[PDB]
Amino acid sequence: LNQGVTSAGAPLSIRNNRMTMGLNDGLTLSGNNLAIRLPGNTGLNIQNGGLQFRFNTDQFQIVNNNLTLKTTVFDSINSRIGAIEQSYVASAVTPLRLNSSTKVLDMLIDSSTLEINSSGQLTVRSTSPNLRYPIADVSGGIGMSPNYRFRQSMWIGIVSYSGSGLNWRVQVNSDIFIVDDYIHICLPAFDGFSIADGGDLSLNFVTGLLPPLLTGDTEPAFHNDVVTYGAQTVAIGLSSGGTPQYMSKNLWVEQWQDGVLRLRVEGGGSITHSNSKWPAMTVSYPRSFT
Amino acid sequence: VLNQGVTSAGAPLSIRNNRMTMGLNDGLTLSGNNLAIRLPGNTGLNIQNGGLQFRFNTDQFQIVNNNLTLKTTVFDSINSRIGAIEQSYVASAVTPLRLNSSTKVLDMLIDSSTLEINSSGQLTVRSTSPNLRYPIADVSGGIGMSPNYRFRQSMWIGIVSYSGSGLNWRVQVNSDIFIVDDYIHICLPAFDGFSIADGGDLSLNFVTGLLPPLLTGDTEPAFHNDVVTYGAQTVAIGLSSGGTPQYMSKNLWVEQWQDGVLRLRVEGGGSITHSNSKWPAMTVSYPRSFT
Amino acid sequence: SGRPVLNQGVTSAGAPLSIRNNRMTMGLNDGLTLSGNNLAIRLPGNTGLNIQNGGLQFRFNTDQFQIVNNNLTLKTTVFDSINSRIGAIEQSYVASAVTPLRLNSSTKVLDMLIDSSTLEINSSGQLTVRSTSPNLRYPIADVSGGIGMSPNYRFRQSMWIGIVSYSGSGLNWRVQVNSDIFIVDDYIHICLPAFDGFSIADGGDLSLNFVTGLLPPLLTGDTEPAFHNDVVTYGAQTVAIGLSSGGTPQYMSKNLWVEQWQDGVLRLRVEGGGSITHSNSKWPAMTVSYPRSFT
Ligand SMILES: CC(=O)N[C@H]1[C@H]([C@H](O)[C@H](O)CO)O[C@@](O[C@H]2[C@@H](O)[C@@H](CO)O[C@@H](O[C@H]3[C@H](O)[C@@H](O)[C@H](O)O[C@@H]3CO)[C@@H]2O)(C(=O)O)C[C@@H]1O
Ligand SMILES: CC(=O)N[C@H]1[C@H]([C@H](O)[C@H](O)CO)O[C@@](O[C@H]2[C@@H](O)[C@@H](CO)O[C@@H](O[C@H]3[C@H](O)[C@@H](O)[C@H](O)O[C@@H]3CO)[C@@H]2O)(C(=O)O)C[C@@H]1O
Ligand SMILES: CC(=O)N[C@H]1[C@H]([C@H](O)[C@H](O)CO)O[C@@](O[C@H]2[C@@H](O)[C@@H](CO)O[C@@H](O[C@H]3[C@H](O)[C@@H](O)[C@H](O)O[C@@H]3CO)[C@@H]2O)(C(=O)O)C[C@@H]1O
């Protein structure tokens, strides 16, 4: 006659009419009750009536009872990356050059045509103009060489007369003026001897020109052509030791040959005479150039 | 006196034929003879440190307010890389620099009339010739003075006409013509003519007789057709009736150019009765018109 | 056994077991519950915990998380998209610039420094060379857009209305003349008209006072010779002057030249050719030229 408990299955056990329960770590006594033991704080908690897992709600969420990352935890990142992607420089076209390693951007330039200003600005390399005399640099700009516009010199030499067997020479001191493309030889008045109706007066430029003027500087632009250039009247006083009679003769530049300028002197009739008084005469003609 | 004790039990305990047993669902099991929590596999749960704990990579996660939270260090590398780019990078380009945001290509806009890219990828200014106006011209590569302006020679073969006080006559002559800088020089030779008046005109007809490429217009003075007294000078003219000429000192000047005809005034110095005149060679010069 | 009270079966129990009126029960905290007749772990809601595979398991997205050494670990693939997008930018991007290229690191704006005098940005936004007027010096000048010769240098005309004064061995007098003036290249030409004067000597001076009488744009200084105030024998020529005392003129072939310009007065020398007794002089028209001073 017994209706009590005389044996028990694990985790229950009986000793001397007293029953106890064996518990592994994880299960514990809480007051009079059996409880799940959760040491420390590892995201597990007894709450809302049972065992739950706890997670930051800004970083995590539960989807089909699975722990899942909140898609927003990445938004800040993708936002910053999308900001750069939408508009940035990845490649550069010449003259632009991009070193993909040091990520430095520079530009290729021709050093003969372009340069870098002290203030880092791109400037066109200034160049001096290529000029040919009489065009020249005048106080910094493209101008006309002063030497072309006016050059003064001097000739101290021999004038020779020759006509119909009559011959004689005189020495003159003469200013020379070169102005643009003309030379002017300013012969002074002088005395000579008999002259023919027609004859030539020769200026020997082979010697007597003041340095640095040279014989070749007196060559006409028509070189050694025979011309009738600069024709004019000259009044020459003819006498035989008394009052001279003035004859109106015709004079022109006739020919330059090897540094000797020949002038023709003819016309106006003549008289018997032994001496001639010549006026100052300026003789001009276009000058040779290179 | 018998104390017979427990005779019934409530779930999860039950008694049958004097034996008590405890029923268990999955999750609860026996570890020997002790009650235990069942954790199949490896899902982050473990019995450790006295009980049930959740396990996590300590470099990626931390526990804050007993809440599983992402450790910030996890993003440190991402934040450093993006920050390194953000601090300095090109997002926009100002002209002439151009940025195509859809291809990430940076190029530059250049005017192809003044600039270009050479064979070595360098930016170079186009070579350009100076813009020059005659008589300034290119002389052997440089900016110089046109040789043609400095000296040009031609020739006129034509008629000089005298006119004075009902006297008229003509003489065919040839004459070299020299144009030098802004002057023209017409080099007439000596010639014989007929009776002249005390005062009168000598006219050169340039409408014909000029040697190509010279044209009539090239003989126009810089003062055009105004009446002037230019290049006044003395000319001795021999007058006679067949005998020995008597030379009159007359006064000659350029008076007017009209329709290709250059008129020279010739007057002064007196006159005598005569039928013939011996004219000296005369050079006529004046500043010449230009464009 | 003299024991006054005999215990049979189970008469007491340790917590969590308890006995009331011969019934044994189990006390349970939240987290433990009854599923039918069985003890069960209670998992309220859905928080990643589940009874499955025979026990208590934790559930996680298998694309985002993984288990290493029974630890919850972030699956490395979840940052792959981010690491590639960033890396793509890294391999090639402009971080810095070298002058004249200029990058504002704070606005992400790239531009280029240029000289405003030698370079410009045209209408179509291109970089173009600034068209610049060449540095010229008169008489070289701009002529309809090209480097040319100033028309003013090539030919300029005016007039002098003034006094010509004769002086010579006591004989002196003056006459008013209107004279065209032409300046051509580096020369000045004074075109004196014919005029009448009084007694002249064998040698004498004819002076032109340019201090007054010049018509603008000409000024006195414009008549200075290129040889300044040197005494010269320039442009020497023959001039026939008619001498008389009321009757028939006798024409003397005299010799005239430009001799000296001083303080705006151009002095011409007139000598030679003999002379006679006379009270009147009939001068011809005479053009006087010389090279002109410049700057
Ligand atoms: C996630 C968590 O909170 N874990 C706790 C656990 C769980 O709450 C428990 O395992 C669920 O069954 O408990 C831990 O022990 C604490 C717990 O027993 C409570 C119960 O009241 O007492 C805490 O300290 C008490 C202490 O008993 C008193 O003497 C003291 O005067 O007051 C304290 C509280 O103010 C226990 O420490 C555990 O280790 O299992 C603590 C975990 O953090
Ligand atoms: C995270 C982890 O380590 N999971 C283990 C678990 C847990 O450690 C365990 O549930 C905590 O209580 O153990 C696992 O292996 C056990 C499992 O096969 C059970 C099934 O009943 O048997 C266990 O051996 C027991 C056995 O059941 C008893 O008869 C014996 O008297 O005691 C043994 C020791 O407790 C295994 O250890 C599991 O699957 O639950 C393996 C997981 O990896
Ligand atoms: C993570 C999870 O699944 N949580 C469940 C839990 C766990 O399954 C359980 O605690 C583990 O032991 O169960 C919850 O209760 C549900 C559970 O008891 C089932 C058992 O079959 O019944 C559900 O009630 C339903 C029932 O299924 C229907 O037959 C009935 O007609 O309607 C009821 C609902 O009105 C329980 O909801 C729990 O809260 O512990 C539910 C969790 O979501």
mmCIF file of C-alpha atoms in Angstrom, chain A:
data_model
loop_
_atom_site.group_PDB
_atom_site.id
_atom_site.type_symbol
_atom_site.label_atom_id
_atom_site.label_comp_id
_atom_site.label_asym_id
_atom_site.label_seq_id
_atom_site.Cartn_x
_atom_site.Cartn_y
_atom_site.Cartn_z
ATOM 1 C CA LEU A 1 0.000 0.000 0.000
ATOM 2 C CA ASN A 2 2.033 2.937 -1.341
ATOM 3 C CA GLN A 3 0.999 5.864 -3.557
ATOM 4 C CA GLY A 4 4.067 8.067 -3.168
ATOM 5 C CA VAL A 5 7.149 8.733 -5.246
ATOM 6 C CA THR A 6 9.933 6.151 -4.798
ATOM 7 C CA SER A 7 12.131 6.975 -7.794
ATOM 8 C CA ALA A 8 12.697 9.849 -10.218
ATOM 9 C CA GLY A 9 14.263 10.453 -13.606
ATOM 10 C CA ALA A 10 17.120 12.888 -14.143
ATOM 11 C CA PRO A 11 17.554 15.733 -13.523
ATOM 12 C CA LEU A 12 15.551 14.835 -10.427
ATOM 13 C CA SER A 13 17.128 12.662 -7.773
ATOM 14 C CA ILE A 14 16.005 11.362 -4.390
ATOM 15 C CA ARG A 15 18.026 10.896 -1.206
ATOM 16 C CA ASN A 16 16.412 10.130 2.179
ATOM 17 C CA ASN A 17 12.869 11.075 1.097
ATOM 18 C CA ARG A 18 14.136 14.411 -0.242
ATOM 19 C CA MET A 19 14.062 15.379 -3.914
ATOM 20 C CA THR A 20 16.552 17.709 -5.607
ATOM 21 C CA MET A 21 17.316 18.811 -9.132
ATOM 22 C CA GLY A 22 20.742 18.912 -10.764
ATOM 23 C CA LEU A 23 21.624 21.994 -12.820
ATOM 24 C CA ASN A 24 24.436 22.761 -15.259
ATOM 25 C CA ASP A 25 25.870 26.228 -15.782
ATOM 26 C CA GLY A 26 23.267 28.225 -17.663
ATOM 27 C CA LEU A 27 20.470 27.288 -15.286
ATOM 28 C CA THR A 28 20.348 28.675 -11.786
ATOM 29 C CA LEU A 29 18.216 29.280 -8.691
ATOM 30 C CA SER A 30 16.603 32.703 -8.525
ATOM 31 C CA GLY A 31 14.886 33.000 -5.164
ATOM 32 C CA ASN A 32 12.654 29.934 -5.128
ATOM 33 C CA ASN A 33 12.589 29.669 -8.922
ATOM 34 C CA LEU A 34 14.511 28.044 -11.772
ATOM 35 C CA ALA A 35 16.073 30.730 -13.984
ATOM 36 C CA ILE A 36 18.254 31.094 -17.052
ATOM 37 C CA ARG A 37 21.631 32.490 -15.953
ATOM 38 C CA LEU A 38 23.083 35.272 -18.140
ATOM 39 C CA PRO A 39 26.448 36.384 -16.729
ATOM 40 C CA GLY A 40 27.737 39.846 -17.639
ATOM 41 C CA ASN A 41 26.260 41.824 -20.531
ATOM 42 C CA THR A 42 26.552 40.077 -23.891
ATOM 43 C CA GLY A 43 23.294 41.206 -25.504
ATOM 44 C CA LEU A 44 21.046 38.608 -23.904
ATOM 45 C CA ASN A 45 18.368 39.599 -21.401
ATOM 46 C CA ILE A 46 15.233 38.385 -19.672
ATOM 47 C CA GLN A 47 12.624 40.893 -20.803
ATOM 48 C CA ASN A 48 9.150 41.074 -22.324
ATOM 49 C CA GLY A 49 8.337 37.747 -20.662
ATOM 50 C CA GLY A 50 11.323 35.715 -21.809
ATOM 51 C CA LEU A 51 14.788 35.428 -23.299
ATOM 52 C CA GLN A 52 15.587 38.036 -25.952
ATOM 53 C CA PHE A 53 18.608 39.359 -27.831
ATOM 54 C CA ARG A 54 19.343 43.111 -27.781
ATOM 55 C CA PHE A 55 20.866 45.133 -30.638
ATOM 56 C CA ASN A 56 21.435 48.791 -31.484
ATOM 57 C CA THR A 57 18.357 49.791 -33.476
ATOM 58 C CA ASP A 58 20.251 52.307 -35.621
ATOM 59 C CA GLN A 59 22.707 49.687 -36.856
ATOM 60 C CA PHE A 60 20.756 46.433 -36.729
ATOM 61 C CA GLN A 61 17.312 45.035 -37.472
ATOM 62 C CA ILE A 62 15.594 41.638 -37.465
ATOM 63 C CA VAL A 63 14.342 40.264 -40.790
ATOM 64 C CA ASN A 64 12.611 36.875 -40.838
ATOM 65 C CA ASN A 65 14.010 36.475 -37.318
ATOM 66 C CA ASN A 66 17.543 36.955 -38.649
ATOM 67 C CA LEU A 67 20.050 39.518 -37.404
ATOM 68 C CA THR A 68 20.484 41.982 -40.285
ATOM 69 C CA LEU A 69 22.466 45.184 -40.850
ATOM 70 C CA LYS A 70 20.406 48.339 -41.215
ATOM 71 C CA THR A 71 20.902 49.510 -44.803
ATOM 72 C CA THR A 72 21.231 53.037 -43.415
ATOM 73 C CA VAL A 73 24.445 52.312 -41.500
ATOM 74 C CA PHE A 74 26.129 52.657 -44.906
ATOM 75 C CA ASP A 75 24.254 55.692 -46.232
ATOM 76 C CA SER A 76 26.745 58.220 -44.840
ATOM 77 C CA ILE A 77 29.528 56.399 -46.698
ATOM 78 C CA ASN A 78 27.792 55.810 -50.031
ATOM 79 C CA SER A 79 26.647 59.416 -49.829
ATOM 80 C CA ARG A 80 30.232 60.692 -49.635
ATOM 81 C CA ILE A 81 31.456 58.341 -52.362
ATOM 82 C CA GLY A 82 28.586 59.218 -54.692
ATOM 83 C CA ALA A 83 29.399 62.884 -54.163
ATOM 84 C CA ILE A 84 32.921 62.377 -55.513
ATOM 85 C CA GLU A 85 32.003 59.945 -58.291
ATOM 86 C CA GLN A 86 29.336 62.169 -59.851
ATOM 87 C CA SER A 87 32.028 64.706 -60.749
ATOM 88 C CA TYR A 88 35.797 64.264 -60.494
ATOM 89 C CA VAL A 89 38.872 64.331 -62.736
ATOM 90 C CA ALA A 90 40.330 60.908 -63.512
ATOM 91 C CA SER A 91 42.140 61.582 -66.795
ATOM 92 C CA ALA A 92 43.760 64.611 -68.437
ATOM 93 C CA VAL A 93 44.289 65.380 -72.134
ATOM 94 C CA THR A 94 47.443 67.027 -73.507
ATOM 95 C CA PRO A 95 48.735 69.564 -72.873
ATOM 96 C CA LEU A 96 47.208 68.547 -69.527
ATOM 97 C CA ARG A 97 49.118 65.679 -67.905
ATOM 98 C CA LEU A 98 48.029 63.631 -64.880
ATOM 99 C CA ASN A 99 50.428 61.400 -62.964
ATOM 100 C CA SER A 100 48.067 58.747 -61.578
ATOM 101 C CA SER A 101 50.508 57.970 -58.752
ATOM 102 C CA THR A 102 51.427 61.273 -57.094
ATOM 103 C CA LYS A 103 48.082 62.530 -58.403
ATOM 104 C CA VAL A 104 49.692 65.781 -59.533
ATOM 105 C CA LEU A 105 48.245 67.762 -62.436
ATOM 106 C CA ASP A 106 50.528 69.841 -64.659
ATOM 107 C CA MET A 107 50.536 71.112 -68.240
ATOM 108 C CA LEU A 108 53.083 70.729 -71.038
ATOM 109 C CA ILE A 109 54.338 73.962 -72.618
ATOM 110 C CA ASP A 110 56.931 74.934 -75.236
ATOM 111 C CA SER A 111 59.624 76.865 -73.366
ATOM 112 C CA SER A 112 60.576 78.875 -76.467
ATOM 113 C CA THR A 113 57.091 80.325 -76.967
ATOM 114 C CA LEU A 114 55.542 80.250 -73.480
ATOM 115 C CA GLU A 115 56.854 80.672 -69.938
ATOM 116 C CA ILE A 116 55.802 80.917 -66.294
ATOM 117 C CA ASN A 117 55.445 84.364 -64.741
ATOM 118 C CA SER A 118 56.951 85.007 -61.303
ATOM 119 C CA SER A 119 53.352 85.146 -60.075
ATOM 120 C CA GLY A 120 52.782 81.676 -61.530
ATOM 121 C CA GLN A 121 50.831 83.037 -64.494
ATOM 122 C CA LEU A 122 51.142 81.665 -68.021
ATOM 123 C CA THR A 123 52.671 84.357 -70.245
ATOM 124 C CA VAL A 124 53.657 84.391 -73.914
ATOM 125 C CA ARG A 125 57.452 84.599 -74.152
ATOM 126 C CA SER A 126 58.179 88.127 -75.386
ATOM 127 C CA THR A 127 60.316 88.233 -78.533
ATOM 128 C CA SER A 128 62.389 90.955 -80.171
ATOM 129 C CA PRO A 129 61.300 91.707 -83.767
ATOM 130 C CA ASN A 130 63.622 90.742 -86.613
ATOM 131 C CA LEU A 131 64.507 94.099 -88.260
ATOM 132 C CA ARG A 132 66.469 95.121 -91.357
ATOM 133 C CA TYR A 133 68.220 98.482 -91.665
ATOM 134 C CA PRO A 134 67.072 101.197 -92.197
ATOM 135 C CA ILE A 135 64.355 99.749 -89.953
ATOM 136 C CA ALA A 136 65.849 99.373 -86.494
ATOM 137 C CA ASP A 137 65.230 99.420 -82.772
ATOM 138 C CA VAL A 138 64.619 103.007 -81.701
ATOM 139 C CA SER A 139 64.487 103.510 -77.927
ATOM 140 C CA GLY A 140 62.675 100.199 -77.538
ATOM 141 C CA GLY A 141 60.304 100.191 -80.494
ATOM 142 C CA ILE A 142 60.265 99.491 -84.210
ATOM 143 C CA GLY A 143 61.509 102.742 -85.726
ATOM 144 C CA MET A 144 63.671 104.265 -88.437
ATOM 145 C CA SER A 145 67.424 104.259 -87.841
ATOM 146 C CA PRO A 146 68.702 107.808 -87.167
ATOM 147 C CA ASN A 147 71.827 107.041 -89.178
ATOM 148 C CA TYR A 148 69.632 106.499 -92.252
ATOM 149 C CA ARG A 149 67.727 109.739 -91.684
ATOM 150 C CA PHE A 150 70.866 111.845 -91.490
ATOM 151 C CA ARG A 151 74.598 111.133 -91.762
ATOM 152 C CA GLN A 152 77.324 113.736 -92.133
ATOM 153 C CA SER A 153 80.831 113.350 -93.502
ATOM 154 C CA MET A 154 83.489 115.195 -95.477
ATOM 155 C CA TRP A 155 85.581 114.921 -98.623
ATOM 156 C CA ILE A 156 88.949 116.598 -98.955
ATOM 157 C CA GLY A 157 90.165 115.715 -102.425
ATOM 158 C CA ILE A 158 90.850 116.560 -106.026
ATOM 159 C CA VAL A 159 88.425 117.807 -108.681
ATOM 160 C CA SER A 160 89.749 117.290 -112.241
ATOM 161 C CA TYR A 161 88.598 119.101 -115.346
ATOM 162 C CA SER A 162 89.019 117.688 -118.829
ATOM 163 C CA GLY A 163 87.702 119.063 -122.106
ATOM 164 C CA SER A 164 88.951 119.152 -125.677
ATOM 165 C CA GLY A 165 92.559 118.694 -124.542
ATOM 166 C CA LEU A 166 92.278 121.105 -121.632
ATOM 167 C CA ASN A 167 93.248 119.573 -118.281
ATOM 168 C CA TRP A 168 93.711 120.889 -114.728
ATOM 169 C CA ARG A 169 93.033 119.933 -111.110
ATOM 170 C CA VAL A 170 91.943 121.728 -107.955
ATOM 171 C CA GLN A 171 91.671 120.696 -104.312
ATOM 172 C CA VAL A 172 88.380 121.231 -102.452
ATOM 173 C CA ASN A 173 87.150 120.712 -98.904
ATOM 174 C CA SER A 174 83.570 119.475 -99.118
ATOM 175 C CA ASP A 175 80.841 118.528 -96.641
ATOM 176 C CA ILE A 176 78.943 115.353 -97.498
ATOM 177 C CA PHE A 177 75.399 114.763 -96.289
ATOM 178 C CA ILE A 178 73.574 111.480 -96.668
ATOM 179 C CA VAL A 179 69.850 111.708 -96.092
ATOM 180 C CA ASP A 180 67.521 108.799 -96.634
ATOM 181 C CA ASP A 181 68.393 107.293 -99.989
ATOM 182 C CA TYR A 182 70.304 110.341 -101.346
ATOM 183 C CA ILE A 183 73.852 111.570 -101.037
ATOM 184 C CA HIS A 184 74.668 115.292 -101.298
ATOM 185 C CA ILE A 185 78.179 116.481 -102.078
ATOM 186 C CA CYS A 186 78.490 120.165 -101.195
ATOM 187 C CA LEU A 187 81.347 121.491 -103.317
ATOM 188 C CA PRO A 188 82.629 124.927 -102.283
ATOM 189 C CA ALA A 189 83.452 127.733 -104.754
ATOM 190 C CA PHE A 190 86.837 127.346 -106.468
ATOM 191 C CA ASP A 191 89.115 128.724 -109.178
ATOM 192 C CA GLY A 192 90.327 126.826 -112.205
ATOM 193 C CA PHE A 193 91.852 127.463 -115.580
ATOM 194 C CA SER A 194 90.625 127.357 -119.158
ATOM 195 C CA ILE A 195 87.526 125.285 -119.960
ATOM 196 C CA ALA A 196 86.146 124.028 -123.296
ATOM 197 C CA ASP A 197 82.597 124.515 -124.512
ATOM 198 C CA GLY A 198 81.909 120.961 -123.378
ATOM 199 C CA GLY A 199 83.848 118.962 -120.806
ATOM 200 C CA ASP A 200 83.736 116.830 -117.671
ATOM 201 C CA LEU A 201 84.495 117.519 -114.037
ATOM 202 C CA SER A 202 85.711 114.490 -112.070
ATOM 203 C CA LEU A 203 85.449 113.958 -108.329
ATOM 204 C CA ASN A 204 88.044 111.458 -107.110
ATOM 205 C CA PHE A 205 86.450 109.719 -104.136
ATOM 206 C CA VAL A 206 89.115 106.966 -104.126
ATOM 207 C CA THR A 207 90.925 109.080 -101.514
ATOM 208 C CA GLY A 208 89.952 111.948 -99.194
ATOM 209 C CA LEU A 209 86.748 110.642 -97.625
ATOM 210 C CA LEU A 210 86.702 111.018 -93.837
ATOM 211 C CA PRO A 211 86.522 107.702 -91.980
ATOM 212 C CA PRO A 212 84.360 105.799 -91.568
ATOM 213 C CA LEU A 213 82.828 106.771 -94.919
ATOM 214 C CA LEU A 214 84.355 104.744 -97.769
ATOM 215 C CA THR A 215 84.649 105.068 -101.542
ATOM 216 C CA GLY A 216 81.798 102.579 -102.033
ATOM 217 C CA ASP A 217 79.447 104.841 -100.056
ATOM 218 C CA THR A 218 79.439 107.320 -102.929
ATOM 219 C CA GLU A 219 78.202 104.839 -105.534
ATOM 220 C CA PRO A 220 74.855 105.846 -107.145
ATOM 221 C CA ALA A 221 71.848 103.535 -107.042
ATOM 222 C CA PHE A 222 72.107 103.454 -110.831
ATOM 223 C CA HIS A 223 75.658 102.152 -110.279
ATOM 224 C CA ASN A 224 77.885 102.896 -113.276
ATOM 225 C CA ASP A 225 75.144 103.695 -115.794
ATOM 226 C CA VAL A 226 75.600 106.819 -117.876
ATOM 227 C CA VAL A 227 72.791 109.214 -116.922
ATOM 228 C CA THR A 228 71.701 112.829 -117.324
ATOM 229 C CA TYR A 229 70.827 113.255 -113.644
ATOM 230 C CA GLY A 230 70.308 116.410 -111.579
ATOM 231 C CA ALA A 231 70.735 118.684 -114.578
ATOM 232 C CA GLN A 232 71.064 122.361 -113.646
ATOM 233 C CA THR A 233 72.464 125.783 -114.562
ATOM 234 C CA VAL A 234 75.836 126.878 -113.244
ATOM 235 C CA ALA A 235 77.341 130.287 -113.820
ATOM 236 C CA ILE A 236 81.101 130.267 -114.376
ATOM 237 C CA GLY A 237 83.201 133.413 -114.562
ATOM 238 C CA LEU A 238 85.756 133.366 -117.400
ATOM 239 C CA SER A 239 88.554 135.915 -117.566
ATOM 240 C CA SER A 240 92.098 136.691 -118.571
ATOM 241 C CA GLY A 241 93.160 138.694 -115.536
ATOM 242 C CA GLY A 242 90.374 141.243 -115.689
ATOM 243 C CA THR A 243 86.688 141.423 -114.858
ATOM 244 C CA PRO A 244 85.232 137.976 -115.565
ATOM 245 C CA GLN A 245 82.358 137.333 -117.928
ATOM 246 C CA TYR A 246 79.877 134.851 -116.486
ATOM 247 C CA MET A 247 78.758 131.998 -118.720
ATOM 248 C CA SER A 248 75.595 130.044 -118.018
ATOM 249 C CA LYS A 249 76.709 126.443 -118.352
ATOM 250 C CA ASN A 250 74.644 123.248 -118.012
ATOM 251 C CA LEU A 251 75.836 120.689 -115.453
ATOM 252 C CA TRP A 252 74.687 117.156 -114.634
ATOM 253 C CA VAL A 253 75.777 113.957 -112.932
ATOM 254 C CA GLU A 254 76.906 111.764 -115.806
ATOM 255 C CA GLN A 255 78.609 108.636 -114.433
ATOM 256 C CA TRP A 256 80.225 107.028 -111.425
ATOM 257 C CA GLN A 257 83.013 104.604 -112.252
ATOM 258 C CA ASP A 258 85.355 102.969 -109.755
ATOM 259 C CA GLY A 259 84.948 105.667 -107.116
ATOM 260 C CA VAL A 260 85.278 108.587 -109.539
ATOM 261 C CA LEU A 261 82.143 110.694 -110.113
ATOM 262 C CA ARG A 262 82.006 112.350 -113.540
ATOM 263 C CA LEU A 263 79.893 115.493 -114.046
ATOM 264 C CA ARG A 264 79.242 116.921 -117.499
ATOM 265 C CA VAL A 265 79.677 120.690 -117.945
ATOM 266 C CA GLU A 266 78.606 122.115 -121.301
ATOM 267 C CA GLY A 267 76.614 124.736 -123.181
ATOM 268 C CA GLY A 268 76.191 128.482 -122.784
ATOM 269 C CA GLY A 269 78.764 129.448 -125.395
ATOM 270 C CA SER A 270 82.349 130.421 -124.574
ATOM 271 C CA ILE A 271 84.986 133.122 -124.899
ATOM 272 C CA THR A 272 88.753 133.318 -124.981
ATOM 273 C CA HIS A 273 89.995 132.979 -121.398
ATOM 274 C CA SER A 274 92.779 131.620 -119.217
ATOM 275 C CA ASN A 275 91.069 131.472 -115.791
ATOM 276 C CA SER A 276 87.721 130.203 -114.519
ATOM 277 C CA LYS A 277 85.819 131.094 -111.362
ATOM 278 C CA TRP A 278 83.454 128.339 -110.295
ATOM 279 C CA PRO A 279 80.480 128.857 -107.961
ATOM 280 C CA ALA A 280 79.675 126.659 -104.975
ATOM 281 C CA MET A 281 77.753 123.679 -106.393
ATOM 282 C CA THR A 282 75.806 121.015 -104.539
ATOM 283 C CA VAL A 283 75.663 117.685 -106.336
ATOM 284 C CA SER A 284 73.011 115.103 -105.371
ATOM 285 C CA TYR A 285 71.930 111.683 -106.532
ATOM 286 C CA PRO A 286 70.237 108.524 -105.255
ATOM 287 C CA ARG A 287 72.684 106.381 -103.269
ATOM 288 C CA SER A 288 73.372 102.645 -103.608
ATOM 289 C CA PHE A 289 72.153 100.280 -100.862
ATOM 290 C CA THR A 290 72.332 96.604 -99.876
#
